[PDB]
Amino acid sequence: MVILGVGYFLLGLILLYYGSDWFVLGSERIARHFNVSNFVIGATVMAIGTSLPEILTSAYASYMHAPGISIGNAIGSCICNIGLVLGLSAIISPIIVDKNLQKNILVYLLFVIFAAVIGIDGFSWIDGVVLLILFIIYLRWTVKNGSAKNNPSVVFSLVLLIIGLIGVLVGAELFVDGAKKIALALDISDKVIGFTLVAFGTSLPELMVSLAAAKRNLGGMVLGNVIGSNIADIGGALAVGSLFMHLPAENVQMAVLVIMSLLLYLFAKYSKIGRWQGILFLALYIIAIASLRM
Numbered sequence: 488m489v490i491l492g493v494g495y496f497l498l499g500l501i502l503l504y505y506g507s508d509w510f511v512l513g514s515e516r517i518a519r520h521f522n523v524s525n526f527v528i529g530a531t532v533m534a535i536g537t538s539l540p541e542i543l544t545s546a547y548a549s550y551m552h553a554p555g556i557s558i559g560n561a562i563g564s565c566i567c568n569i570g571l572v573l574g575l576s577a578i579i580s581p582i583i584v585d586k587n588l589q590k591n592i593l594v595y596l597l598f599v600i601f602a603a604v605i606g607i608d609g610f611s612w613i614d615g616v617v618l619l620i621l622f623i624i625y626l627r628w629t630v631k632n633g634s635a636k637n638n639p640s641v642v643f644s645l646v647l648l649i650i651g652l653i654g655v656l657v658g659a660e661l662f663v664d665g666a667k668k669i670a671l672a673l674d675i676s677d678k679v680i681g682f683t684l685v686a687f688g689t690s691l692p693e694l695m696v697s698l699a700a701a702k703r704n705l706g707g708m709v710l711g712n713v714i715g716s717n718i719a720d721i722g723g724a725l726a727v728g729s730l731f732m733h734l735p736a737e738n739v740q741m742a743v744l745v746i747m748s749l750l751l752y753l754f755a756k757y758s759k760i761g762r763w764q765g766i767l768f769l770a771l772y773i774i775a776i777a778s779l780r781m
């Protein structure tokens with residue numbers, strides 16, 4: 488304790504920093520290998536790999552019969568990806584969305600609006616089955632319109648990707664396990680200074696990765712990672728949670744998510760996603776974490 492905490496906390500940070508860059512660089516090479524856009528590889532492989540925390544957290548929480556945590560973490564992640572993650576990235580590297588990716592973003596918007604409507608009375612296991620299938624359909628529709636021996640260039644790409652993903656997922660855990668151990672060693676522990684850490688802990692992979700890609704001017708990869716993770720949270724994390732137990736209705740946050748998603752579409756179609764658009768997202772996020780709950 489106390490001293491393994493500092494060790495775990497910053498070592499996890501080291502793995503998050505370098506792991507994100509490796510995961511980003513590895514994905515960018517894979518995308519060029521399979522002849523797909525950076526958006527696509529971010530909306531799929533990267534998004535799912537980074538949304539694995541939410542999925543396993545929602546499943547565990549719902550099964551341990553705390554479905555409030557399940558949906559709370561899922562929607563809290565979506566809001567965080569648009570407000571915080573996309574907010575920081577847009578400022579770092581402004582994005583002018585092409586006419587093709589606007590179509591993917593509008594589809595994302597419809598998916599989110601649909602989730603919000605069927606979630607008013609909560610999320611039944613049937614609701615989850617529906618969202619999970621749309622999730623699969625989205626992944627395939629996204630890959631198709633972005634598509635078309637022992638190559639050492641491909642192998643090196645896959646290693647960077649996998650080691651990078653391991654780096655950010657383990658790194659997010661050490662960060663999480665390190666901060667938790669510090670608080671208890673210092674007796675300052677509360678347990679929504681409890682489910683504060685993993686709500687943010689699950690979003691650390693998306694954050695660092697998108698920051699990494701933003702440093703390399705990969706706006707498409709960042710945007711894809713944001714869109715994909717959110718869908719992977721609703722159609723993936725939220726869905727699995729409903730399979731174990733009915734999820735309580737979070738209508739306030741859904742409205743917030745719908746509003747942020749609507750804005751994201753509008754900016755992508757008629758404007759750009761740069762400095763002042765990113766500033767708005769951050770402000771909304773800061774208001775959200777200053778006014779919301781659960």
Ligand SMILES: CCCCCCCC/C=C\CCCCCCCC(=O)OC[C@H](O)CO
Pocket residue numbers: 600603604607737738739741742745
């Ligand atoms: C608005 C704050 C709601 C706080 C929670 C209790 C609300 C009352 C419970 C049932 C009444 C009808 C609730 C209707 C909720 C509609 C959907 C919504 O609020 O989210 C965005 C919408 O789906 C985009 O189309």
Ligand SMILES: CCCCCCCCCCCCCCC
Pocket residue numbers: 612730731
């Ligand atoms: C590919 C994953 C498929 C998951 C299907 C989960 C079905 C869960 C059904 C739970 C039923 C609980 C009792 C309802 C009366």
Ligand SMILES: [Ca+2]
Pocket residue numbers: 537538539540541564689690691692693716
């Ligand atoms: Ca995540």
Ligand SMILES: [Ca+2]
Pocket residue numbers: 605606607608609610611614
């Ligand atoms: Ca429902």
